[model samples]
Target: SMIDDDGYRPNVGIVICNRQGQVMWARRFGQHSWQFPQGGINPGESAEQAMYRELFEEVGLSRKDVRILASTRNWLRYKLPKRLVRWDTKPVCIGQKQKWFLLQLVWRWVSYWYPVRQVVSFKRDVYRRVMKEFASVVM
Candidate 1:
């Protein structure tokens, strides 16, 4: 089974937005489709700590660089498909139980329309435009 008796695995995901509230969507390290920044939590680290660490590791963002707008009050769960599950891995993650955080870019001094550093398959310019409109709610 992918999950243990208890349903907790410690993971972090970020919904990064610009001043306008458009979330930062990025392609996975080697995949084509894009999603929010997410990763497994490290040993002994709290969820908040893991979120900040994953943000920088995956998207080059720091805590000071963004303003936290909202976060899920409880954990959200999603189970991976059978084919996607890895049997050999330890602590077998059946799926994920996550606490999603919404962050707004605070650095108005920098250009908000810049391309995401390493995501190539996804169109950066188009995404930026989407971000502008979506971020309007946060303003």
Candidate 2:
């Protein structure tokens, strides 16, 4: 319910990095594409709060498992394809504007790095931007 006047829902984007500097990426629900963990921010929650909640919900990772590195100062946005937008909603969320967080895994490691082409087309650019911005801070 955090859709703004322009219909861009406020959300949090989480990039989980292991010590080797590889980010955690996963297959989208039932689809062939891969993406990072992300979810919407509720009306009263802070962006960081939302990020932690979504991280646990999506991947079962908790605060003690990771350390926060850096985050984007501004919200990065992506629009959904027309066919993917929901039309039945009141405000009609057309896309998401996200505050991205870089979380470093304190213990385990994985090979979920990247093949940029594997991410859904609509989210590629924003994902690129976030990675670029957080590049310097990663392990």
Candidate 2 lDDT over 1-139, as tens digits, reads 4789988999888888776667787654756546788788899899989988988888888999999999987888778888998898787988888899988878223453363445777777787788778877752
Tens digit of lDDT per residue, candidate 1, span 1-139?
A: 1233554565666767655434466666555546567777666667788889888887787989988777655666566666767778677666666666767778112233443433343334433433354355455
Weakest 10 consecutive residues, lDDT, candidate 1? 107-116
Off by over 4 Å in 1: 1-8, 88-91, 107-139
TM-score per candidate, chains pooled: 0.65, 0.83
Q: Deviation in angstroms for 46 in model 1?
A: 0.9
How well does candidate 2 score on lDDT at residue 13?
A: 84
Judging by lDDT against the true structure, name the best candidate.
Answer: 2
Every candidate's lDDT = 0.61, 0.78
Evaluated with TM-score, which candidate comes out highest? 2
